[model samples]
Target: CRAVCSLNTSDRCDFVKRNPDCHSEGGYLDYLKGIFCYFPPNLLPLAITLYVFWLLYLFLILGVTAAKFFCPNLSAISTSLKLSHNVAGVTFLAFGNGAPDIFSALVAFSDPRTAGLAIGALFGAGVLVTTVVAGGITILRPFMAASRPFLRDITFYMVAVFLTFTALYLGRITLVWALGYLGLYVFYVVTVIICTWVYQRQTTGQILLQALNPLDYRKWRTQSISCKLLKVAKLPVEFLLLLTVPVVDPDKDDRNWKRPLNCLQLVISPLVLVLTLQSGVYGIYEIGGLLPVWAVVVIVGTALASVTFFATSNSEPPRLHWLFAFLGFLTSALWINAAATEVVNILRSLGVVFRLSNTVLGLTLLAWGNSIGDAFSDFTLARQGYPRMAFSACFGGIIFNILVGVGLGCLLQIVRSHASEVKLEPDGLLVWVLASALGLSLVFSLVSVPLQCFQLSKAYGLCLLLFYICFIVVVLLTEFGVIHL
Candidate 1:
């Protein structure tokens, strides 16, 4: 919200003097500094506090949908699903951890202040994803792993970016459009499912074997233990509730009660997660103002360090690899969070003094912040020797973002409006610019993909990074009124 609302205001630091008596007898410079430093320490905490409770309520909706949608294939594709989970944990876990962003955006669309935060955070995140995060990853990969990215990956990413721009420009969509995006997502999921089945079939062919595959008690037991542990860890509150519940009534055997409590713990896990996440987001934001710049630097720096150390770390067992993956994922999320707060603080300073428009603010600051995780993840994947997969996933995730995230966002708004009766003003001008940017990126990415795929090189990666830098400069110039078009 602060990011989108105050983007342009910060650009005028040199040209415009601060309003001296705006609040007190402070000097113009002091006033400006104060405004720059004006974030209320408790703002994010308060917002997070509200979001947590709100998400707990919304959890019922998400849970039911996810369960109903994925139930049938749960038995067959469990392993593949687990792999995706691990991958996502390490990659998308950071920025993606904020389930509230989706819900918050939904709520914000109905309220201006919240909406501002939504816009700011979104744009801010987007920029961070593209530049600093992506740049850092690219820089890290060639230095450690001897690999590059794939063309397929770049193509998908371009497609996602293009589609997102298209949706932003189209604004309010019809049921048909919503259905179209949903259908595309379904198709994508199906494709992945088929691919998984084919891969496993080759590895372990035979219908009966496949049918009896899941019955392997060892694998199932391990999975069950992991699931039980995850459920407990993911939702500590629910874990507590079940543990404290009276398992052995004076009249009944203690064992029977234990079973019910265990089941109850699992059932309430999602609810507890939603609540805890809500609170965490708020706490981070509230104390965000008090967080020193160096602290953010250390957080971000530590992420890079982990990425560097692990990428070059000596050959280790698979378990150790998984731990590294987990660490990488956790650090990525933390880095994104830190970057976002800094970006938002910067934006707020602009808003309190210079008065940037919501659209402009959202397009630049919020977008960058939202994107950092993606950029870094993409780069990190290349470093991991799965450049092709990394590139593909990067673009694939973006498609998911637009199709799933933004698509659902707009769809929900329409549903809430009881029809396609809502007016949406998604910065059309910026959409055009975004589209142009994506097109340019596509050209560069396509060139680099083939080059890197054949022989991954730092030079090609640097070229891609350079192109993005040029694009950003152009966007900044436009924002500053130096470039009219």
Candidate 2:
């Protein structure tokens, strides 16, 4: 009864002094209220509501910025390098595709309270993309699934899921399991490279398999009136970020922007990176106790920017200007990582308020949020008459997410805790149920997919859509307590 009111107190009153949270834990918003306790007690509920919606808005924008502003820079650089086909396909594409999930997984394992969400979101997204999204692709454009790649991906996925279940059941993660996750991913990547090489040997004689798009915001500048207004409305933010973030479009001659402004971007962008990455709670911004990291960053960035500004008049970026693409990738990834931390904190806070388990939040909200993009993108591929590619991506992408997410996430957790083996105490029933539901979905695909003779049919797609329904019902029953531990 007293817990709700305790949320408004600047200092811990009797109810909270004994515990830092109004519920079992304090999320970022809860912790912030310690110093930012300006709200009246009556508005605690309202304050939480506002904070959650705002956090979600921030999440959308951050994801947008990463895809639009940052990752494209990586693409430009990759093209500029003229990398050997397989190396670029295997590493750059995979790195850019899974950046959010990868960082989220790493961040998830860094904290004890948030660990369940890591499993929840990663597996949840996997299930969603595989069942619902994959089903949608077939329903819209039924096509033959690529047999070798399909079987290969599902086999790898089933192995990872089963291994994960076994490890979680025992509740201790050891070094063997952790390293195996990374080792397994290497195995998968190598498989892809070899496959591409073999296929190329038969066909083009040079390997060029992508193992990836440039979203243009300026293209949005000419859309229908309704969209144009919306674009302009958010233009300032996009505009501000564009100025502070250098976009290296090699195809466009170091970007067709104004000469001086591009020069100015050379100056201001690094400072934005420092502030956003000012993430470390443990005095990371502090330099030698006498100088702050931002100050040094500003001084150095200004010097570099000044020298370049007068070095040549409107001269195109240096011969090696494409190298700045790495900077863009770094900053963009940092933004994603920073936003992920906030999202985890926000979800944690909401769980405290709503009495939802971490597993539920991870499965439903975080999982769906992460996979929605994959769903639409994959569906578009099918619509464009690339059903086999779309279907393969559905499984291939999630395989990467879960193996890397859980394997590496758990490893980092153990390392951070500095223990021989880290014990993960997840929400007992929901997690098992999550694993079971996911297992069933996979098994259904495993059996029925082959039964259909690797031909994705409309009827099979319906079964998948129905499979997702059953999953939701089971999860709801578990959360409602009808299904107990």
Candidate 1 lDDT score at position 98: 43
* Predicted candidate 1 versus true structure: per-residue lDDT over 209-327, tens digit per residue: 34222234555566677775554443443323223221211222221222222233333333333223323343244335677433454455556545544554222222222232232
The estimated TM-scores of all candidates read: 0.49, 0.85
- Per model, state how many residue pairs clash: 40, 0
lDDT of each: 0.43, 0.70
Instruction: Tell me model 2's lDDT, rounded to 2 decimals.
Output: 0.70
The 10 consecutive residues of candidate 2 with the worst lDDT sum are 204-213
Name the weakest run of 10 consecutive residues (lDDT summed) in model 1: 64-73
Q: Report the lDDT tens digits of candidate 2 across residue range 119-168.
A: 88877877788789999998999887777778888898998889888988
Residue pairs with colliding backbones in model 2 are none
TM-score of 2: 0.85
Model 1 Cα displacement at 362 (Å)? Answer: 2.4
lDDT of 2 at 422: 65
Q: What shift in Å separates residue 324 of candidate 1 from its native position after superposition?
A: 26
